[PDB]
Design a protein around this ligand. Sequence first.
Ligand SMILES: C[C@@H](O)[C@H](NC(=O)c1ccc(C#CC#Cc2ccccc2)cc1)C(=O)NO
Ligand SMILES: [Zn+2]
Ligand SMILES: [Zn+2]
Length: 297
Amino acid sequence: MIKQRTLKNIIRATGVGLHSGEKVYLTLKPAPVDTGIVFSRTDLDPVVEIPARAENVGETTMSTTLVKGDVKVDTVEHLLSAMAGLGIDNAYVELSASEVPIMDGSAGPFVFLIQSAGLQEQEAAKKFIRIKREVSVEEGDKRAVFVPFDGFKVSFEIDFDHPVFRGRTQQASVDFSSTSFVKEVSRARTFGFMRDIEYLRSQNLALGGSVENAIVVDENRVLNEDGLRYEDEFVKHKILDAIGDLYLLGNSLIGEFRGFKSGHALNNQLLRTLIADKDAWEVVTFEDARTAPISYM
Ligand SMILES: C[C@@H](O)[C@H](NC(=O)c1ccc(C#CC#Cc2ccccc2)cc1)C(=O)NO
Ligand SMILES: [Zn+2]
Ligand SMILES: [Zn+2]
């Protein structure tokens, strides 16, 4: 059978929050079967735990925030993307502050942490959520969709008209049958437009941002000295973001996500909309890994 997976060892890193600019200690730890991912604010007294599930998402302002009462864990999407991409079912994530460190702006640093810790197979069947019927949500011209698919695929289109984006692909459809999350998605950095970043900074936000952890573009140019890591890094980051949000479903997906100018708010609306309709999905396991349309080997 395809087994659940956790970390083999505890592993740590430090960084600063993008929004807050606050130095933060991050710890990833093994967890038992059927735990899922649970975040812990270890700086608080008492310590507050928040399961990484769609129902615990509060704010979605250019990022995904988990909330429990007045306690928040901000910017979970890049770390969760790495967890999803490497097939980690169960883990504890400890934080000394209310925001996951931004690191280099991508999921790469979290992939490094996970691969360094090692992967541990557990004695329980891994559960998958299979999309049975297409589900969609919209806001204005933005759209997010789950489509049945015998495998796992994430498609995304952005539609910027600014000169800097002219001629760029602005679209990708990634079938993970033949695409490596690690090599081809995980290192795509977050990006921001100068006018937007300036607006945030003018309010004392985005304090952790720098050219060292984000792609900065103006109307006409990519400002970063060494350009892009992937030819289509922008849309690849949107895909990375979607995969991170997808993981709030609590299980790996058998299906396709399609995003059209979508963001974290719409992604999360899609999750809650799917979850609510039991006719649109089912949970499956594979006692014989060879019959599975996906592979985590
Ligand atoms: C992509 C979107 O969904 C989103 N990213 C952001 O909203 C975002 C916000 C701020 C910055 C920034 C910055 C900066 C800076 C800087 C540079 C030089 C000197 C001082 C500051 C980058 C991305 C995101 O990726 N969510 O997952
Ligand atoms: Zn423009
Ligand atoms: Zn992002």
